[PDB]
Amino acid sequence: KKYSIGLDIGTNSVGWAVITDEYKVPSKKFKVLGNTDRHSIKKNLIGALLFDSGETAERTRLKRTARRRYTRRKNRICYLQEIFSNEMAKVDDSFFHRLEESFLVEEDKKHERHPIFGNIVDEVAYHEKYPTIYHLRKKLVDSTDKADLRLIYLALAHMIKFRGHFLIEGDLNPDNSDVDKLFIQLVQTYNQLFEENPINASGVDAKAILSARLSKSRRLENLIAQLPGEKKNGLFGNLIALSLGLTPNFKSNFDLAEDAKLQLSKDTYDDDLDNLLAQIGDQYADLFLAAKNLSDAILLSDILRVNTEITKAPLSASMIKRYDEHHQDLTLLKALVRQQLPEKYKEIFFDQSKNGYAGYIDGGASQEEFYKFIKPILEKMDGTEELLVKLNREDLLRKQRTFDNGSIPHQIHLGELHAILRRQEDFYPFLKDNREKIEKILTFRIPYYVGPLARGNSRFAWMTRKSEETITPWNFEEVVDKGASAQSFIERMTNFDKNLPNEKVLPKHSLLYEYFTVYNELTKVKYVTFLSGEQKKAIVDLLFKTNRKVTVKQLKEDYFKKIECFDSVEISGVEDRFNASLGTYHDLLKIIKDKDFLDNEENEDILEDIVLTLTLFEDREMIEERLKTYAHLFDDKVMKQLKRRRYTGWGRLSRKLINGIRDKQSGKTILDFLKSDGFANRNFMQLIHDDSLTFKEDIQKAQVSSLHEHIANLAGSPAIKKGILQTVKVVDELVKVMGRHKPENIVIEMQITKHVAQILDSRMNTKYDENDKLIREVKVITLKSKLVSDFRKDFQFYKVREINNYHHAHDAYLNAVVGTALIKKYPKLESEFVYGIMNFFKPLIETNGETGEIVWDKGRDFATVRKVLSMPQVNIVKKTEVQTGGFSKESIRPKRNSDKLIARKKDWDPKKYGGFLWPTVAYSVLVVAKVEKGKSKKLKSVKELLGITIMERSSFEKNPIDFLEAKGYKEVKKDLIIKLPKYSLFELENGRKRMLASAKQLQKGNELALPSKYVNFLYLASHYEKLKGSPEDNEQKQLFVEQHKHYLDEIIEQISEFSKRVILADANLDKVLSAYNKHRDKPIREQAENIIHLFTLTRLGAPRAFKYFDTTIDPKQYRSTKEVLDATLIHQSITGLYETRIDLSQLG
């Protein structure tokens, strides 16, 4: 009658088991549908559901963003062509069409093959006169004669398309571009953080060292030699190193156990920086982005070598000079190789595969790979001294389109564009009429607070229009309602506090947030000669509001000796210094310099609105609008300074916590308790946890604000959200199985915010009374994994991950057993364990104590649990998933005559244009039909699977019949079409099971049910000297493992039986048997660890390459789905108890 369900929720697995009050798993005869002979199967109420991990939105957001960038870039080109078209049509009628169709082959091209002029002589003349685009750009800047209109378009389109970055706001000035200025800014912020032992740099000339044409490392050592107090391995040297790009290490600076690689030029630098500042705190982030902008300045200086001259456009002239140096160096290298080392000349300049110059240009070799190939050649060669030093400084044979161009601000391209539009202004009137239009095309950037320029059909947009017309950069300022868009931006990008929802979160740079973290840091301090309120106020007013960094030595020298007259004070609450600080307070104090205004409690809301404004917005305009209200408090000299300061990040707590709700008896908020708490000071989470105060009850009553509609608003990690949803479906189906009877109690695995117990309690308990707020029909019991792991450890019920996935179901059943025993043994800890200690397991018969009911015997319950742990039939279910995502791999392969290449566009034949490969199959489809085979055409019937990929999924689901007819299948029987997703289960002879991984790939789907004594012996054979228990238990397991050495031979016999039954890998079987026989005399450690990896051959899933002692066994791949056309297809529910077996041999 009464029964319990245990669960074990994981990221990739959900275990489940049904127990009775006698700790026995029931077994029932389940009905099975389908056309098969079987009508009822005996199955057990224990099993596990296995599924792929849920992915985060991150990659999808990245591709979405990149796709938006591509669309907006193409729209910029469309705007420029729309400007040029009316005049260009009189000069060249088919110029834009030739640019559009330049991709196509000459056969598919309606116009001439030459894009720019359409005549070969003029094209050759163009490429002789301007070998790069930068030559044309520099001429158009530096020529006063009338130029061709199409060349002007090419230059303007080139710098509008590749327009550089927007990181520097306003005009370009030496205050944020000249390397000395941001170097002084870096030393100022470094001294601001490290107030103690400052580093001074006044007589140094940073443009002399950092902009010098020398090697990077020697520049680092020269700069260190200019600073006697520092070393190259020091923190300042490390900062200068990653400003230069040497990939330095921060582990030595902070005694980190793990290495601390950081590089700005890496493909993704934000992530390792994020972990690094998670380890050391966020105060240093000012120093890191100061180093990043110093790197931007250094790179911008080195690519602009013609910065010494104001006689030309800098970028174009420098790039021309780079081309000239590349040419005159390449000809020298060619001659010197051809004369002084004639062998391997063809390997360098002809081969185009071995990272030579031909591999540098015509192959896929980077700059540093080419350098690493050529530096040994130059070292063996002679006369290369002047050439090798360029490679040492990475200035040898550089290209014009490299990764270093990401430092170029958009102001340089804007200046070149303005110079061209002013040099050609009088010659073309439509350039004079549209100069501001073209400059607005280049310089317009959609604000962060506007987002997608949609019209209600976007999940992501929030922008509110003031008119209904097309948005262009020219009329953006008079169409979008910036106030309403900014307000909606505020309402959407804010997070909400987890402890108290519906509440606006404070910024992490908020003033009261810094007050909270300072006070929570400071109230847990004890001094020996706990603080009182006046002492805390004096310390904060004297030290925290005077310097950012407060150490123990400053506090004992400046407060107790100066004010309290205490000579010797011992402090134990804080070790060396106070990690939290009033950074925002001192920043604003530096800005306005009106300190008593900051000390007034009436100004808390206005200052909080100011910091909220700079936390939300990054662009200048709405920042200016939002605090233009406060211009009558103080004047422009501070306005122009606080309009440029920006904050980033958000806190975890809301204002309604800190100085919000109030205690009924004490009359004090959280922060009011942090002001004074009597003798025994108590912390924030201690104030929450204390049940005497009404704070906890106020938190819990305000916590509350179809099944899928109830999931559609949930919060938490995306990987475990899948686990909660699947465990809800599993619990629902298990209730459905046993005659709709609800369990007596449900045990949930784990301090951890288990909202899953709240969900299950809400779904099971749906009844209430006028006096009882909720009836506890089902008691969701929450247990920690420490208890069950200890229970496995001490009573010899061990487990491994490598043998089979029975450990999930075994864990779930053990959770159920320990939870039921715990609630039944101590009923008074029910409120402790049910939402809303080990020693009794080890008298030989235990009782309830208050009642005569028997809760645990050390007799037949141990035999029952050992039988269940040794019980072979466990319902392991792999969730059948329709594959979604990108329909192919993103690499674009060259042209070939294969028909397997996927077309990159509708009109682009992949035989001539290349295309993608490796498509992803969403699901497979069983078809029976007739296929026209043979030269003498007859109709042969055939039954075979066909893979429907993600790209053809929609075209298949609109109308399958003509989609199958387009593939050659005719006379298709429509009713026999069976959709087969991934991990579809098939059963063959001798109980052999195969899981459908694709249309042409199978997987192992059988389970090795190894007995419990063998798994105990295999666990005990491993971990030979790392139990860390007691010496007597240690030696107990040593003799236990040594006198049963025949168990390994019995176990390998078990593998040789099981893999001969269902795996059918005979060659690998002979390899493992030979390697076991010839490595039989090795000790138990290596033998045990390698037989633990030996189960990879028989593990369910894809065949993976395991390894023995020395030999490595290649996997046996099942690249043939021909055997499942006559197998028995199994349709398993989420628990696998209900099945529908379809015999495919009776079809077709």
Q: What string marks each residue from 1030 to 1069 as x (binds DNA by CB under 7 A) or -?
A: -------------------------------------x--
**Partner interacting with residue 898 (select from DNA, RNA, none; CB below 5-8 Å by kind):** DNA
Q: Is 223 left (phi over 0), alpha (psi -120 to 50) or beta?
A: alpha
| Smallest separation (angstroms) from DNA to the CB of 896 | 6
Binding of residue 265 to DNA (CB under 7 A): no
| Smallest separation (angstroms) from DNA to the CB of 1005 | 12
Amino acid, single-letter form, for residue 672: D
- For residues 917 and 888, the answer to whether their CB atoms sit within 8 Å is yes
Binding of residue 1001 to DNA (CB under 7 A): yes
Residue with token string 């792999």:
878
Question: Which residues ranging from 867 to 906 are in contact with DNA (CB under 7 A)?
Answer: 889-891, 893, 896, 898, 900
**Partner interacting with residue 566 (select from DNA, RNA, none; CB below 5-8 Å by kind):** none
Pairwise CA distance, residues 671 & 657, whole Å: 9
Binding of residue 118 to RNA (CB under 7 A): no
Q: What string marks each residue from 383 to 402 as x (binds RNA by CB under 7 A) or -?
A: ----------------xxxx
| Smallest separation (angstroms) from RNA to the CB of 364 | 4
For RNA, which is the closer residue by CB, 240 or 397?
397
For DNA, which is the closer residue by CB, 755 or 879?
879
Question: Which residues ranging from 198 to 257 are in contact with RNA (CB under 7 A)?
Answer: none
Residue with token string 């902009």:
211
Pairwise CA distance, residues 638 & 643, whole Å: 8
Task: Name the DSSP class of 506.
Answer: P
| Smallest separation (angstroms) from DNA to the CB of 12 | 10
Binding of residue 353 to DNA (CB under 7 A): no
Binding of residue 353 to RNA (CB under 7 A): no
User: In sequence order, what are the residues at sequence separation of 6 or more whose Cβ sits closer than 8 angstroms to the Cβ of residue 1111?
Assistant: 1071, 1075
Q: What string marks each residue from 941 to 980 as x (binds DNA by CB under 7 A) or -?
A: ------x---------------------------------
Residue from 451, 507, 743, 1103 touching RNA (CB under 7 A): that is 451
Binding of residue 1102 to DNA (CB under 7 A): yes
- How far lies 143's CA from each of 12, 419, 689, 1040, 1148, in Å? 67, 10, 77, 93, 79
| Smallest separation (angstroms) from RNA to the CB of 450 | 6
Pairwise CA distance, residues 1145 & 1124, whole Å: 9
* 1110 annotated as ligand-binding: yes
Residue from 21, 35, 93, 124 touching RNA (CB under 7 A): that is 124
| Smallest separation (angstroms) from DNA to the CB of 1010 | 21
Residue from 72, 354, 801, 1080 touching RNA (CB under 7 A): that is 72
State the catalytic residues.
8
Q: What string marks each residue from 592 to 631 as x (binds RNA by CB under 7 A) or -?
A: ----------------------------------------
Pairwise CA distance, residues 150 & 90, whole Å: 12
Residue 182 is encoded by which pair of tokens? 């941001």
User: Hey, which residues does 929 pair with through a beta bridge?
Assistant: 942
For DNA, which is the closer residue by CB, 998 or 1087?
998
Phi, psi at residue 865, to the nearest 5°? -70, -30
Q: How many residues bind DNA (CB under 7 A)?
A: 28
Nearest to 161 by CA among 95, 90, 252, 70: 70
For RNA, which is the closer residue by CB, 251 or 754?
754
Binding of residue 1117 to DNA (CB under 7 A): yes
Binding of residue 727 to DNA (CB under 7 A): no
**Partner interacting with residue 947 (select from RNA, DNA, none; CB below 5-8 Å by kind):** DNA
**Partner interacting with residue 322 (select from RNA, DNA, none; CB below 5-8 Å by kind):** RNA
| Smallest separation (angstroms) from RNA to the CB of 1049 | 14
Pairwise CA distance, residues 236 & 250, whole Å: 11
Contact range with RNA by CB under 7 A, out of 529-537, 580-588, 839-847, 1131-1139: 1131-1139
- For residues 995 and 805, the answer to whether their CB atoms sit within 8 Å is no
Binding of residue 615 to DNA (CB under 7 A): no
Nearest to 193 by CA among 246, 231, 235, 225: 235
- Rounded to a whole number of angstroms, the CA Rg of the chain reads 37
Residue from 7, 242, 300, 921 touching DNA (CB under 7 A): that is 921
Binding of residue 999 to DNA (CB under 7 A): yes
- For residues 262 and 275, the answer to whether their CB atoms sit within 8 Å is no
Binding of residue 71 to RNA (CB under 7 A): yes
Amino acid, single-letter form, for residue 1043: Q
Collapsing DSSP to helix, strand or coil, 764 comes out as: helix
Pairwise CA distance, residues 270 & 284, whole Å: 14
Count of beta carbons in the 10 Å neighbourhood of residue 184? 15
Residue with token string 């050439």:
387
**Partner interacting with residue 448 (select from RNA, DNA, none; CB below 5-8 Å by kind):** RNA
| Smallest separation (angstroms) from RNA to the CB of 493 | 5
Phi, psi at residue 691, to the nearest 5°? -80, -15
| Smallest separation (angstroms) from RNA to the CB of 902 | 8
User: In sequence order, what are the residues at sequence separation of 6 or more whose Cβ sits closer than 8 angstroms to the Cβ of residue 825?
Assistant: 840, 846, 848, 849, 855, 856
**Partner interacting with residue 1122 (select from RNA, DNA, none; CB below 5-8 Å by kind):** DNA
Residue from 1003, 1059, 1087, 1133 touching DNA (CB under 7 A): that is 1003
Residue with token string 């920043």:
587
Binding of residue 976 to RNA (CB under 7 A): no
Residue 275 is encoded by which pair of tokens? 């972990």
| Smallest separation (angstroms) from RNA to the CB of 233 | 30
* 404 annotated as ligand-binding: no
For 437-581, strand residue ranges (E) read: 527-528, 570-571
| Smallest separation (angstroms) from DNA to the CB of 453 | 24
- How far lies 334's CA from each of 131, 330, 351, 458, in Å? 20, 6, 14, 57
For RNA, which is the closer residue by CB, 131 or 960?
131
* 749 annotated as ligand-binding: yes
Residue 718 is encoded by which pair of tokens? 């995306």
**Partner interacting with residue 751 (select from DNA, RNA, none; CB below 5-8 Å by kind):** none
Residues 425-434: contacts with CB within 8 Å, 24+ apart? Answer: 427/146, 427/147, 428/87, 428/149, 428/152, 430/83, 430/86, 430/87, 431/152, 434/83
- For residues 856 and 846, the answer to whether their CB atoms sit within 8 Å is yes
Contact range with RNA by CB under 7 A, out of 8-16, 204-212, 338-346, 842-850: 338-346
Residue from 70, 350, 918, 1109 touching DNA (CB under 7 A): that is 918
Residue from 452, 1011, 1101, 1148 touching DNA (CB under 7 A): that is 1101
- For residues 14 and 8, the answer to whether their CB atoms sit within 8 Å is yes
Residue 287 is encoded by which pair of tokens? 């120093």
CA–chain centroid gap for 35, Å, is 47
Residue from 11, 36, 111, 113 touching RNA (CB under 7 A): that is 113
For DNA, which is the closer residue by CB, 161 or 668?
161
What strand order describes the sheet that includes 1139-1143? 40-44, 27-33, 1139-1143, 1128-1132, 984-987, 993-998, 1001-1004
Binding of residue 66 to RNA (CB under 7 A): yes
- 584-600: b (≥16 Cβ within 10 Å) or e: bbbbbbeebeeeebbee
Binding of residue 1064 to RNA (CB under 7 A): no
Binding residues for Mn(2+): 8, 749, 808, 1079, 1110
Interacting residues with DNA (CB under 7 A): 889-891, 893, 896, 898, 900, 917-919, 921, 933, 947, 997-1001, 1003, 1067, 1101-1102, 1104, 1114, 1117, 1119-1120, 1122
